[PDB]
């Protein structure tokens, strides 16, 4: 069962058969105990990450399949083992950051979330540093500024859920940081990119979750300029 998924994920499947099995896998990972998830383990993770990389790296079912993986990832990581095992990967943090394509906003939402939750993790470390480095890594791959995908998601046309998502990741990248000069440096690089013009707009919006992330962004911004 755990083992047949892996076998199937290593079998060269494509398109709807891939989608369908990923969907199946998603429920499996969601409904099953943590022992089944270890059974699926790093070998299972690695095969999801392998297909993900192939989809990221190529260009009808691509977006959906990338998304369904990102969904499978959420489930795998809904326990300690899965969190540890993702963070043990060479490339998995990076393949999440690469899932933040403003053109596919709901997978971006799901990927931004999981990155934000890594950032606020009690153990490991500064996982925010690890996420930034991955964003750096991605920026020169795609030849864009590193915080640009995030500012693209705060654009006026996009869904409130995405807006919330991006601002929430900004907040997860900054809050956990111990250095003031790092924090203000990040804040400042974002404002250079056009964040100040967007906050004006975001601050009009009717949403409680949006109001919450703006409150966090503002209050920490105040206290930092006050400290400095």
């Amino acid at each position: 069962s755990a083992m047949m998924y892996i076998q199937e994920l290593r079998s060269g499947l494509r398109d709807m058969h891939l989608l369908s099995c990923l969907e199946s896998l998603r429920v499996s990972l969601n409904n099953n105990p943590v022992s089944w998830v270890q059974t699926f383990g790093a070998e299972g993770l690695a095969s999801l990450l392998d297909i993900l990389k192939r989809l990221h790296d190529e260009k009808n079912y691509d977006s959906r399949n990338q998304h369904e993986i990102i969904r499978c990832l959420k489930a795998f990581m809904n326990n300690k083992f899965g969190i540890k095992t993702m963070l043990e990967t060479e490339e998995g943090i990076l393949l999440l950051v690469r899932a933040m394509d403003p053109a596919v906003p709901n997978m971006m939402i799901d990927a931004a979330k999981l990155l934000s939750a890594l950032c606020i993790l009690p153990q490991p470390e500064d996982m925010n540093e690890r996420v930034l480095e991955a964003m750096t890594e991605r920026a020169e791959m795609d030849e864009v500024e590193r915080f640009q995908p995030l500012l693209d998601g705060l654009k006026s046309g996009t869904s409130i859920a995405l807006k919330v998502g991006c601002l929430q990741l900004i907040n997860a990248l900054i809050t956990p940081a111990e250095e003031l000069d790092f924090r203000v440096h990040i804040r400042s690089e974002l404002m250079r990119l056009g964040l100040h013009q967007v906050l004006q707009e975001l601050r009009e919006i009717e949403n409680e979750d949006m109001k919450v992330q703006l409150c966090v962004f503002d209050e920490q911004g105040d206290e930092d300029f006050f400290d400095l």
């Binding site: 105990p33 943590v34 022992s35 959420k74 990581m77 809904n78 326990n79 300690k80 899965g82 969190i83 979330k113 999981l114 934000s116 939750a117 606020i120 993790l121 929430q168 907040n171 997860a172 809050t175 979750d209 919450v212 992330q213 409150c215 966090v216 920490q220």
Partner: peptide, 20 residues
């Protein structure tokens, strides 16, 4: 052995408690 770990983190983010 307990699930819903990610689920705890997503909720602390969403409300604002995480920050901190």
């Amino acid at each position: 052995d307990e699930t819903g770990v990610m689920d705890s983190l997503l909720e602390a983010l969403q409300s604002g408690a995480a920050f901190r």
